[PDB]
Each structure stands twice: as C-alpha cells, then as structure tokens.
Design a protein around this ligand. Sequence first.
Ligand code: MET
Ligand SMILES: [Mn+2]
Ligand SMILES: [Mn+2]
Ligand code: NA
Length: 257
Amino acid sequence: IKIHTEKDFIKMRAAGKLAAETLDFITDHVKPNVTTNSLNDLCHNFITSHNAIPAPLNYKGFPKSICTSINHVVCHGIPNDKPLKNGDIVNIDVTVILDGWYGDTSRMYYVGDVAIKPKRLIQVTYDAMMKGIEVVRPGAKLGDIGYAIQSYAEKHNYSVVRDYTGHGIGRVFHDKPSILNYGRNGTGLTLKEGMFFTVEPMINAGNYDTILSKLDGWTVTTRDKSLSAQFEHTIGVTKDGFEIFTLSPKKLDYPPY
Ligand code: MET
Ligand SMILES: [Mn+2]
Ligand SMILES: [Mn+2]
Ligand code: NA
C-alpha cells in the first residue's frame, strides 16, 4: 500500500475537484427521455475540454467514458440508447485522469418524479458512505469502514453488495487495498497517513446477491431485480482524520439538486 506525501495530495485535490465538477455539470441534463449515451457524450467533452482523460474509456475494453447504472443495475452500467423514464433512478460514475492522477466519484440522480421508496434507498446509501468515510484516521482499521456502512444500511432493512468494493487510487485507477463495504470493527489492515482510496458502497433494497451480464461483460444487476443505489468519493488519510477530494463545489451532494 502506497504512502503519499503533501505534493501528491495537491494533485489528488485537483483531479477529484474536476471529477466532482463533471457531476455538478451533468445534473441539469438528467431528464426523462434523455439517453445515457447523450449523458456520456456530455461528460466526455466536459472532461477533455478541461485537459483531462476519462479513465473508463477502453479500461479493460470498457466501451464508454462514464458508467451509468439505472434502477436494478448495481454498478458498471454501459451508456446506451434507451430513453430514461420518469421515476427511474440513475448512478452516474466519473473518473478523470489529470496530470496522471485519478479522481473517482459517483452520485445518484432522480429522473423526473421519483417514488418514496427509491428516494429512501438513495438517502440511506449516501448516509452510509459518509458513516464509512467518517471513521477514517490513522490507526483506524479497514473493517471499521465496512462495519459503519453495513450497520447503517442494515438498520434500514437494506443489504450490502459483497462482490464489488472500493479501492486504492492515485497514479493507478485500481490499487491496493480493497475497501469492503461490509465488515467488523477492529479487523483488517491499519490505516496510515498518506493512503488514498475510494469509498463506494452499493446498497440493495432486497437481497445482496448480484449477477454479471453474460452479454456485455460489465453490467452488474441485482439477482432479485430489486433497486440498488451507490455513491462514491475519493479520499485521503491525513495526520488525524480524512480529506475528501471529490466534494461537489456547488454542494450538490445528494438529490434533490
Ligand atoms: C470501467 S470503470 C469501473 C470503475 C468502477 N465503477 C469504479 O468506481 O472503480
Ligand atoms: Mn467510480
Ligand atoms: Mn471506484
Ligand atoms: Na441502481
């Protein structure tokens, strides 16, 4: 696990800011009848016009510049030509590379008028992410992150996806260690100043089991077809706490926006 210094923190602040600015920008474009392919092109040109690279583009063959995951899609959805429908929920997940450093962040968006139950799932997911980030400091352990997220989700009768995790990040997209979204207090490796990683819980309204698309090699869905929501931030461990690199500059942290 790589230990970074202040010079690298400066670089990660800039990459994370741009990733978060991409998500602020896309907000007003998420409407009924818009396709995820349209949203991908909007984000692509925003990213590149800011002197940066969309990390997902051809990453392990991924065919688009962002991930867009609708309703029972858990993560890694591929932008396509289907119109978004009133009542849908969508995760938009952006990663930019700026001067060689990766900024990774996602948020949930409402499409038109959304029902009470999807809105509850979204809110719980955001809150759970923040419970996880909030334990981070040198001497805390990875399992403390997972316990905080899992406890918060499960107290609301939701489940935590096990098969996909957060990750180290910096000059690499996906580095050590794996940041599990479930766990037990006081277990796992010890956090240290200078570590960078993501916190990206996926929370299901039903059971935690997921399925990977046999057809596109990427799209993950809930096995029970229940709704799933996700938020993500890129963070760093400081001398006595954490720093989030991907905060929305416009304070568009969670919907409604
Ligand atoms: C094809 S990019 C998959 C990236 C994943 N959504 C992440 O946040 O790491
Ligand atoms: Mn991401
Ligand atoms: Mn990530
Ligand atoms: Na979803």
